[PDB]
Amino acid sequence: KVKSIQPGPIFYDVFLVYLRVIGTNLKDWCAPHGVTATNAKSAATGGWNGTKARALRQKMIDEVGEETFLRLYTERLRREAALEH
């Protein structure tokens, strides 16, 4: 059906590439949050799932629009599933 936004590889790429669309990068996005790029990826992929990681994941979603994040994330998943079938 439709999926809600979950962490993982696609979450991380959609956020990473969104920063590119609006012309920042991971490095410069991370700094005002007092966090590392490496910590940003771990939270985004769901590898770190502590509640501090959730707070950061929510900032990534609010950076994109929540609706825009869902649309990018959803259409991307559709394309992978299409190659897997």
Residue numbers in the entry: 4 to 88
From the article:
The AcrVIA6 protein, which targets the type VI‐A CRISPR‐Cas system, has been identified as a potent Cas13a inhibitor. However, there is currently conflicting debate regarding the anti‐CRISPR function of AcrVIA6. This study reveals that AcrVIA6 functions as a DNA‐binding protein rather than a Cas13a inhibitor, as it does not block RNA cleavage.
The protein was crystallized, and its structure was solved at 2.39 Å. The high‐resolution structure of AcrVIA6 revealed a five‐helical bundle fold, modeled from residues 4–85. The helices (α1–α5) span residues 12–25, 29–36, 40–48, 54–67, and 69–85. Electrostatic analysis showed predominantly positive charges. This analysis revealed that Q9, P10, and G11, belonging to the N‐terminal loop, as well as F72, Y76, and R79 in the last helix α5, are completely conserved, along with several conserved glycine residues in the middle. The top five hits, including the transcription regulator C.Esp1396I, were all DNA‐binding proteins. Hence, AcrVIA6 exists as a monomer in a solution, unlike other structurally similar DNA‐binding proteins that form dimers. The long N‐terminal loop, impeding dimer formation, is a distinctive feature of AcrVIA6 and contributes to its binding to dsDNA as a monomer.
